[PDB]
């Protein structure tokens, strides 16, 4: 059997404890009653998406009784770690073997003469995660937590004693560049390092075959040299004999095999045999576009985060190719590995499937004027490059992102990062990402020095979202080129958050409907495809991802994703597919909005509905009557659908293609005369006057509020809340951003009427379960803003609730009785006689009243 | 204002602790460090679906600072408890007020004398869950779990002191019967008691109205009577001929409304007004069928359990109507409320939608020979009936389900419970359900009285599932009439478990595919639709429900539902819709199977596919080509669909109806160098030779296993496990049934190869990851059987995995190094050189080996 085994996984049956005692490195310690976890693992997989603010930053320990197979006797035994969050202290049989810094790169551990091969050993890992590490290790801050743990795999490796120097940086056994390649003939110059950890000397043959994708050999190149024991000998060959090469592209992803056999001269033994995929391509950059192999190429894609729903970042490794395949089939050709490098699998995926890669490290938000800090940033960039190097998919090396002070050590550290990128990797480009707050540094600063470092400049534009409107967005793309005027631009991040529960026919900023997310990404794609100088752009983000602290619709989540945290495709995903993929498609938008309840007194509820597509034309049939053929423009065709009570079958057609979508639509008359709905429950989203919220647990649709008209329902006084004084949001963001405790229905409780003293519904006689949904929406410190929060001089809010003349909640104070921003529900049973219907009163004692929702059920 | 409140919820912000200290009732206790919950609350929502066998049966305490609005001052004030699992012990202001036995019925506590309107009061509930209670109170045992907590709502309510007596069973305030009902006229009898709790004497009119659905008074009648304090005055009036009443059916569930007021004849002040809906119907039973309102009605339905996924039985109250709507929309007219009485709103839902109700109390599995057990059943029969007295939907009252020993005191209690049903309410029918294990008591008792007590005899048949097969189904229904000779019969349970992840073209018993659950019910329907002496039949169950202990494909869940545990529809919910619902429909089987990957070398892969429908004909169009119009026989038309590789589109059409369903198929060659599975990874469910398994988290598809042929893969040795000694499953069921700790992929692990020693896989060259998925499949008790288990006579199983000569796992003891029935995943990186492919040896040092899974990925 000429085939050999190289590593065995060791991710199984570990003992974990959240406590910090230096005794836990002891062979002879008693870990019996520690929890038993399998790897990957992270102690913040739940900590972050909790209702408690903040997650535990600290130290924990992992112990493993680690056996070593006998086939690794007499060999050089190593331990590879693909990913440990922040600092790691690997102890073996009591004795500290290595320490590592950096949460995102792999690292090695030589255990050869320390371990007993055959017997059994104790492997102890102190894993640190503290906030304190920020004064010496990036990332320093940012919009992404760091789940602590050992969250990528761990393996036990062994090779022969004549071996390849990979340390201190877990670099790839042998680097391979392509210095000059074009449509004619190819060049490949390999770099490596053999070392003889034997007792004697050995004299080698070092063979280098380059085999087809069909593995028919195209070249040979055999060398020989003398390795004396302990000498670290440098190899640096080069071949250029390669005829009529098959070139790698994001469309045609052709990879080559470059075998390397190191074999004993007088003996015939094979000591090593690296094999590594390689790609032939070429590219460059300027304000005239991005070019690859000659032709023109616009880079189109997104950034990916390395976490999954409720798993922390201890993802199954198969996840990594699954995330990237969902990007490729979205129609992209580019991915932005941010804000940190990721699993070997990510990179392997993007050059087997074809995806140009942008790869940063986590110098995020700020630098620390600190001797030590800068050193680790370069030690980490040194690891990113040499660990992922023969990967043709990769094109740009990043390191900085969204700084807020390009100070002195900053700009110097900026230069040192570039010098060492093209030093290490001369045949790849470099990149950086600024934010787009031009009222802050580096735009308020003395100079413009920094925009003239890296080969491409990225910008993070969120106009129409965090501030600015529909109109300020092309002006924002403009004045960036004011600065990055030497080198070409790139759209780093852009995206709006969305929730598959909030829908609106008139979407506005920061209501989190997939509707607004659609218009956002359709204004941005139009501005970006027109300008070729911006060589590319990236959606932020491919995924929804979990960051502890973040609020809004799904609290402790970033919702700008194109996939949910569990990788279900949102409808923005299909829109992009229609503007990018060459693989024919059609899709009726609204698959996430299949049940609808809407006030309408006519027979017909006409509502626009759009069909995303690749083709030139789309036909749409409503209930069997075609609505006409229409041309697809910017991926989209918008029909006007005459919706009617009951089932609505919309079937879209265009050529050989199809999509179907059944929309259940319940027309509700404004007079409560004509409605079965009260027997089910009339659920009213108080303070929300332009969105429908659907709770997927009950399928309850929370219809929007309206002012009271005679014979119907609504409020009498009061206004829905939307004051954000001093932002683009004032009068546009309805409701607060708070996470609300004891409810999942955030879009319901966050919306509220303020100052409403009276609510009417004109219902028929009978018994009613009225249920009220309250929360104090404001924190103790924002309640110090007495006008905006409608509270008393001392910040209190006591009011009473009366129904039909009876005081029934006698002094409701939400904050001091239930906690601020905690959900409070009270149900009442009221018998309505005469034809009085329901008159609800909120009598303020201190401050002004608040209600988030109402539910009206006729129970008999 | 003539309107008034009655009740107000007190389910918000409670204090909770799982300790038992009697001081916990004291007003001044410091519950400051206790956790806050809102009701509905259980405390086994987690317990029941975790890995630890069992759940926590014990005592916990609730505390709530109870505020009493002044609107209720010097009125009669009651606490309302809709449900509290087993024993409650309610204290107010330190003083114990009520103790209550029984999880499933409501009780009431009077606080008018003890409470304090305007002060804070302290309301302590001690709640109790111990099996220790099963000796004095049912249920004793049974396929479900008693989720301790206060899991239904709780109300504080107030009346005026002249009030309808409700205690001791918290009955409906006026009882209502219809002794005579026909198309031309109906009679009506109302029953109530009155009490005066003032100091004065009061003279009161009683005003009885009977209003139609438009609330037009169709009958009225007043009664004069005077009430000296404290005396319990009965009343019982009749209402004369009602004339041409609108009857109640599951088709037309017309509902009237008995309005009963009690006013003061001297001034006119109104003391009470009680609104009570009713319907007019009449029914009977014989061996020729069920008759409702004069016509023959085949009763077709399903039972419903109380719980919802991850919420235990602390469901929100609206879920109750959501379930009943889903059920009516499956074509049911019948619901089996079992094994316990359920929420008030299940019964309000059922008689508004149109579903006839069989309603049981919870005397399951055995009757206890104690004087106190029997008494508590009587009092739980009283509580059920008196609380659900007026619901037109209830037609049958139950008490016992599946006894296993009809001993003397059992028959004595079947008798007093029928004697009691007819006493308290003579106008409804009576029912009971038996098991179908003819080899056990009571089918082997000398006597047969137990089969002659209550008016209808149900039977729970699982032939073809727990025992038997296709040949024994109909012979069983006949045997049940051998015993049910006087009273008619009913099919109260029948079902088969299904998993949405396991799919088979050749379904067999206990593989948990929906395609066997399909055939099962087909065979069952067809028999009932021709057996008129089975007046009706109810599927088991409407929902997957949560029960600790049960394992199989999804552990801790009873998987026999029409809907998933979160109320999503399975394939078979649509099959019932074909056979029952009178709403025209069409639907292609396989919406749970759109990703398929099969071994097939020709370009076309013919597979059979069903289309469910109401209609006489379906035409099916695959990829634009029509496959013809097939007649719909007994709900379905199967076709032979010629699947190609790639996207396949299926159009089913019937006049105006149509369903559409795309199916993605990956064809896989036998020879491994013909495709690219290896580059994502070949996932092979070893031990499973007829079901595919879609891991919904990675969307990977564990294909079945085939013995080895050359050029491809498969096992050289051994055999997949399927040994069930003495059972009908013997050879039929592959795998074991135990919960496999540490995974959610129980269909992958529970199946496995046994006694295999060699495994081949003729893959190209390159570097491979190979995962190994293991488990000790049997327990210590189960390994006492050396022969079925394949272990050493001391009970042990040790072996070494080796690949391509080299030994890597050094000697594995599964149940000793990691625990029995835990999941372990090893991963080698091995370098296939030359043309060796992959040899995998399992070498046993004790017993025979086992192995569940294989992933084979080509990484470079
Ligand atoms: Na609201
Ligand atoms: Na298996």
PDB file of C-alpha atoms in Angstrom, chain A residues 1-9 11-13 38 69-71 153 155 158 270 273 275 277 308 311 316-319 321-322 325 345 348 352 649 651 653 658 660 662 678-680 696-700 742 767 769 773 804-810 818 823 825-834 836-837 839 855 857-860, chain B residues 1-9 12-13 36 38 69-71 153 155 158 270 273 275 277 308 311 316-319 321-322 325 345 348 352 649 653 658-660 662 679-680 697-700 742 766-767 769 773 804-810 817-818 823-834 836 839 855 857-860:
ATOM      1  CA  UNK A   1       0.000   0.000   0.000  1.00  0.00           C
ATOM      2  CA  UNK A   2       1.898   3.047  -1.271  1.00  0.00           C
ATOM      3  CA  UNK A   3      -0.955   5.175   0.145  1.00  0.00           C
ATOM      4  CA  UNK A   4      -0.355   6.656   3.616  1.00  0.00           C
ATOM      5  CA  UNK A   5      -2.458   8.216   6.388  1.00  0.00           C
ATOM      6  CA  UNK A   6      -1.448  11.734   7.459  1.00  0.00           C
ATOM      7  CA  UNK A   7      -3.741  13.043  10.245  1.00  0.00           C
ATOM      8  CA  UNK A   8      -6.533  11.828  12.515  1.00  0.00           C
ATOM      9  CA  UNK A   9      -9.234  14.127  13.855  1.00  0.00           C
ATOM     10  CA  UNK A  11     -12.569  16.702  18.020  1.00  0.00           C
ATOM     11  CA  UNK A  12     -14.431  14.143  20.158  1.00  0.00           C
ATOM     12  CA  UNK A  13     -15.053  13.787  23.928  1.00  0.00           C
ATOM     13  CA  UNK A  38     -17.538  17.667  21.133  1.00  0.00           C
ATOM     14  CA  UNK A  69      -1.666   5.810  17.028  1.00  0.00           C
ATOM     15  CA  UNK A  70       1.279   3.458  16.793  1.00  0.00           C
ATOM     16  CA  UNK A  71       1.776   4.169  13.060  1.00  0.00           C
ATOM     17  CA  UNK A 153     -11.526  21.561  14.098  1.00  0.00           C
ATOM     18  CA  UNK A 155      -6.225  17.264  14.278  1.00  0.00           C
ATOM     19  CA  UNK A 158       2.475  13.109  11.709  1.00  0.00           C
ATOM     20  CA  UNK A 270       9.110   8.621  -0.170  1.00  0.00           C
ATOM     21  CA  UNK A 273       4.338  14.214  -1.008  1.00  0.00           C
ATOM     22  CA  UNK A 275      -0.243  18.088  -3.589  1.00  0.00           C
ATOM     23  CA  UNK A 277      -4.522  22.849  -6.378  1.00  0.00           C
ATOM     24  CA  UNK A 308     -25.091  29.870  11.980  1.00  0.00           C
ATOM     25  CA  UNK A 311     -24.731  27.528  17.073  1.00  0.00           C
ATOM     26  CA  UNK A 316     -20.189  22.081  11.028  1.00  0.00           C
ATOM     27  CA  UNK A 317     -17.345  22.400   8.587  1.00  0.00           C
ATOM     28  CA  UNK A 318     -19.592  21.402   5.677  1.00  0.00           C
ATOM     29  CA  UNK A 319     -21.391  24.693   6.348  1.00  0.00           C
ATOM     30  CA  UNK A 321     -19.033  25.141   1.197  1.00  0.00           C
ATOM     31  CA  UNK A 322     -22.816  25.434   1.680  1.00  0.00           C
ATOM     32  CA  UNK A 325     -22.546  27.616  -3.013  1.00  0.00           C
ATOM     33  CA  UNK A 345     -12.903  25.039   3.349  1.00  0.00           C
ATOM     34  CA  UNK A 348     -11.215  25.489  -1.269  1.00  0.00           C
ATOM     35  CA  UNK A 352     -13.545  24.719  -7.147  1.00  0.00           C
ATOM     36  CA  UNK A 649     -53.489  32.146  -7.553  1.00  0.00           C
ATOM     37  CA  UNK A 651     -48.794  32.195 -11.753  1.00  0.00           C
ATOM     38  CA  UNK A 653     -44.681  32.639 -16.862  1.00  0.00           C
ATOM     39  CA  UNK A 658     -42.510  29.232 -14.244  1.00  0.00           C
ATOM     40  CA  UNK A 660     -46.342  29.969  -8.620  1.00  0.00           C
ATOM     41  CA  UNK A 662     -50.939  31.315  -3.736  1.00  0.00           C
ATOM     42  CA  UNK A 678     -64.120  39.104  15.857  1.00  0.00           C
ATOM     43  CA  UNK A 679     -64.759  35.438  16.667  1.00  0.00           C
ATOM     44  CA  UNK A 680     -61.145  34.722  15.693  1.00  0.00           C
ATOM     45  CA  UNK A 696     -45.723  32.798  12.483  1.00  0.00           C
ATOM     46  CA  UNK A 697     -46.527  30.829  15.681  1.00  0.00           C
ATOM     47  CA  UNK A 698     -50.269  31.611  15.576  1.00  0.00           C
ATOM     48  CA  UNK A 699     -50.496  32.857  11.975  1.00  0.00           C
ATOM     49  CA  UNK A 700     -52.077  35.924  13.642  1.00  0.00           C
ATOM     50  CA  UNK A 742     -40.684  38.166  27.601  1.00  0.00           C
ATOM     51  CA  UNK A 767     -68.953  38.985  25.590  1.00  0.00           C
ATOM     52  CA  UNK A 769     -61.913  39.058  25.654  1.00  0.00           C
ATOM     53  CA  UNK A 773     -50.226  44.809  25.093  1.00  0.00           C
ATOM     54  CA  UNK A 804     -67.093  51.457  29.348  1.00  0.00           C
ATOM     55  CA  UNK A 805     -66.969  53.541  32.521  1.00  0.00           C
ATOM     56  CA  UNK A 806     -65.301  51.063  34.882  1.00  0.00           C
ATOM     57  CA  UNK A 807     -61.779  51.654  36.111  1.00  0.00           C
ATOM     58  CA  UNK A 808     -60.117  48.257  35.796  1.00  0.00           C
ATOM     59  CA  UNK A 809     -56.333  48.847  36.060  1.00  0.00           C
ATOM     60  CA  UNK A 810     -56.050  51.278  38.956  1.00  0.00           C
ATOM     61  CA  UNK A 818     -42.631  45.184  35.625  1.00  0.00           C
ATOM     62  CA  UNK A 823     -43.688  42.828  27.825  1.00  0.00           C
ATOM     63  CA  UNK A 825     -50.254  41.735  28.735  1.00  0.00           C
ATOM     64  CA  UNK A 826     -53.624  42.086  30.464  1.00  0.00           C
ATOM     65  CA  UNK A 827     -56.842  40.502  29.222  1.00  0.00           C
ATOM     66  CA  UNK A 828     -60.311  41.730  30.126  1.00  0.00           C
ATOM     67  CA  UNK A 829     -63.714  40.108  29.769  1.00  0.00           C
ATOM     68  CA  UNK A 830     -66.354  42.768  29.012  1.00  0.00           C
ATOM     69  CA  UNK A 831     -70.115  42.264  28.406  1.00  0.00           C
ATOM     70  CA  UNK A 832     -71.357  44.843  25.875  1.00  0.00           C
ATOM     71  CA  UNK A 833     -75.074  45.725  25.905  1.00  0.00           C
ATOM     72  CA  UNK A 834     -77.219  48.526  24.448  1.00  0.00           C
ATOM     73  CA  UNK A 836     -72.340  50.911  23.379  1.00  0.00           C
ATOM     74  CA  UNK A 837     -69.509  48.875  21.870  1.00  0.00           C
ATOM     75  CA  UNK A 839     -64.885  52.718  24.862  1.00  0.00           C
ATOM     76  CA  UNK A 855     -56.851  42.168  20.586  1.00  0.00           C
ATOM     77  CA  UNK A 857     -62.235  38.447  20.567  1.00  0.00           C
ATOM     78  CA  UNK A 858     -65.968  37.751  20.698  1.00  0.00           C
ATOM     79  CA  UNK A 859     -66.202  34.620  22.841  1.00  0.00           C
ATOM     80  CA  UNK A 860     -70.044  34.361  23.055  1.00  0.00           C
TER      81      UNK A 860
ATOM     82  CA  UNK B   1     -73.308  52.607  30.452  1.00  0.00           C
ATOM     83  CA  UNK B   2     -75.131  49.257  30.640  1.00  0.00           C
ATOM     84  CA  UNK B   3     -71.912  47.300  30.015  1.00  0.00           C
ATOM     85  CA  UNK B   4     -69.710  45.789  32.691  1.00  0.00           C
ATOM     86  CA  UNK B   5     -66.568  43.799  33.164  1.00  0.00           C
ATOM     87  CA  UNK B   6     -66.590  40.348  34.737  1.00  0.00           C
ATOM     88  CA  UNK B   7     -63.033  39.008  34.836  1.00  0.00           C
ATOM     89  CA  UNK B   8     -59.468  40.288  34.515  1.00  0.00           C
ATOM     90  CA  UNK B   9     -56.380  38.216  33.786  1.00  0.00           C
ATOM     91  CA  UNK B  12     -48.665  38.398  34.283  1.00  0.00           C
ATOM     92  CA  UNK B  13     -45.353  38.440  36.195  1.00  0.00           C
ATOM     93  CA  UNK B  36     -40.251  35.799  37.094  1.00  0.00           C
ATOM     94  CA  UNK B  38     -45.739  34.761  32.948  1.00  0.00           C
ATOM     95  CA  UNK B  69     -59.652  46.971  41.426  1.00  0.00           C
ATOM     96  CA  UNK B  70     -62.083  49.181  43.332  1.00  0.00           C
ATOM     97  CA  UNK B  71     -64.730  48.513  40.651  1.00  0.00           C
ATOM     98  CA  UNK B 153     -54.846  30.957  32.026  1.00  0.00           C
ATOM     99  CA  UNK B 155     -58.625  34.944  36.052  1.00  0.00           C
ATOM    100  CA  UNK B 158     -66.399  39.401  40.182  1.00  0.00           C
ATOM    101  CA  UNK B 270     -79.831  43.996  37.086  1.00  0.00           C
ATOM    102  CA  UNK B 273     -77.040  38.377  32.773  1.00  0.00           C
ATOM    103  CA  UNK B 275     -75.095  34.505  27.850  1.00  0.00           C
ATOM    104  CA  UNK B 277     -74.832  29.611  23.233  1.00  0.00           C
ATOM    105  CA  UNK B 308     -46.867  22.648  21.077  1.00  0.00           C
ATOM    106  CA  UNK B 311     -43.664  25.148  24.787  1.00  0.00           C
ATOM    107  CA  UNK B 316     -51.154  30.251  24.204  1.00  0.00           C
ATOM    108  CA  UNK B 317     -54.891  29.992  24.226  1.00  0.00           C
ATOM    109  CA  UNK B 318     -55.367  30.891  20.563  1.00  0.00           C
ATOM    110  CA  UNK B 319     -53.477  27.720  19.493  1.00  0.00           C
ATOM    111  CA  UNK B 321     -58.747  27.388  17.806  1.00  0.00           C
ATOM    112  CA  UNK B 322     -55.824  27.192  15.349  1.00  0.00           C
ATOM    113  CA  UNK B 325     -59.471  25.132  12.114  1.00  0.00           C
ATOM    114  CA  UNK B 345     -61.957  27.361  23.763  1.00  0.00           C
ATOM    115  CA  UNK B 348     -66.145  27.071  21.602  1.00  0.00           C
ATOM    116  CA  UNK B 352     -68.611  27.294  15.672  1.00  0.00           C
ATOM    117  CA  UNK B 649     -41.148  20.199 -13.053  1.00  0.00           C
ATOM    118  CA  UNK B 653     -54.298  19.617 -13.320  1.00  0.00           C
ATOM    119  CA  UNK B 658     -53.671  22.665 -10.271  1.00  0.00           C
ATOM    120  CA  UNK B 659     -50.653  21.995  -8.028  1.00  0.00           C
ATOM    121  CA  UNK B 660     -47.028  22.454  -9.097  1.00  0.00           C
ATOM    122  CA  UNK B 662     -40.268  21.088  -8.876  1.00  0.00           C
ATOM    123  CA  UNK B 679     -15.768  17.182  -3.757  1.00  0.00           C
ATOM    124  CA  UNK B 680     -18.688  17.955  -1.465  1.00  0.00           C
ATOM    125  CA  UNK B 697     -29.168  21.477   8.371  1.00  0.00           C
ATOM    126  CA  UNK B 698     -26.534  20.846   5.655  1.00  0.00           C
ATOM    127  CA  UNK B 699     -29.053  19.656   2.994  1.00  0.00           C
ATOM    128  CA  UNK B 700     -26.832  16.584   2.584  1.00  0.00           C
ATOM    129  CA  UNK B 742     -24.993  13.762  20.994  1.00  0.00           C
ATOM    130  CA  UNK B 766      -6.019  12.404  -4.267  1.00  0.00           C
ATOM    131  CA  UNK B 767      -6.311  13.284  -0.582  1.00  0.00           C
ATOM    132  CA  UNK B 769     -11.205  13.168   4.454  1.00  0.00           C
ATOM    133  CA  UNK B 773     -20.115   7.656  12.454  1.00  0.00           C
ATOM    134  CA  UNK B 804      -4.960   1.026   3.401  1.00  0.00           C
ATOM    135  CA  UNK B 805      -2.785  -1.054   5.724  1.00  0.00           C
ATOM    136  CA  UNK B 806      -2.343   1.598   8.387  1.00  0.00           C
ATOM    137  CA  UNK B 807      -4.079   1.277  11.752  1.00  0.00           C
ATOM    138  CA  UNK B 808      -5.507   4.563  13.008  1.00  0.00           C
ATOM    139  CA  UNK B 809      -8.229   3.945  15.595  1.00  0.00           C
ATOM    140  CA  UNK B 810      -6.261   1.789  17.956  1.00  0.00           C
ATOM    141  CA  UNK B 817     -14.919   5.058  26.119  1.00  0.00           C
ATOM    142  CA  UNK B 818     -17.849   7.318  25.214  1.00  0.00           C
ATOM    143  CA  UNK B 823     -22.654   9.531  18.792  1.00  0.00           C
ATOM    144  CA  UNK B 824     -18.932   9.495  17.931  1.00  0.00           C
ATOM    145  CA  UNK B 825     -17.496  10.856  14.656  1.00  0.00           C
ATOM    146  CA  UNK B 826     -13.878  10.075  13.708  1.00  0.00           C
ATOM    147  CA  UNK B 827     -12.210  11.750  10.704  1.00  0.00           C
ATOM    148  CA  UNK B 828      -9.057  10.521   8.995  1.00  0.00           C
ATOM    149  CA  UNK B 829      -7.116  12.346   6.305  1.00  0.00           C
ATOM    150  CA  UNK B 830      -5.664   9.598   4.090  1.00  0.00           C
ATOM    151  CA  UNK B 831      -3.679   9.949   0.828  1.00  0.00           C
ATOM    152  CA  UNK B 832      -4.811   7.577  -1.920  1.00  0.00           C
ATOM    153  CA  UNK B 833      -1.710   6.969  -4.086  1.00  0.00           C
ATOM    154  CA  UNK B 834      -1.261   4.989  -7.305  1.00  0.00           C
ATOM    155  CA  UNK B 836      -5.311   1.500  -4.565  1.00  0.00           C
ATOM    156  CA  UNK B 839      -9.786  -0.338   1.747  1.00  0.00           C
ATOM    157  CA  UNK B 855     -18.542  10.454   4.636  1.00  0.00           C
ATOM    158  CA  UNK B 857     -14.671  13.857   0.763  1.00  0.00           C
ATOM    159  CA  UNK B 858     -11.886  14.648  -1.734  1.00  0.00           C
ATOM    160  CA  UNK B 859     -10.113  17.710  -0.320  1.00  0.00           C
ATOM    161  CA  UNK B 860      -7.151  17.986  -2.754  1.00  0.00           C
TER     162      UNK B 860
END
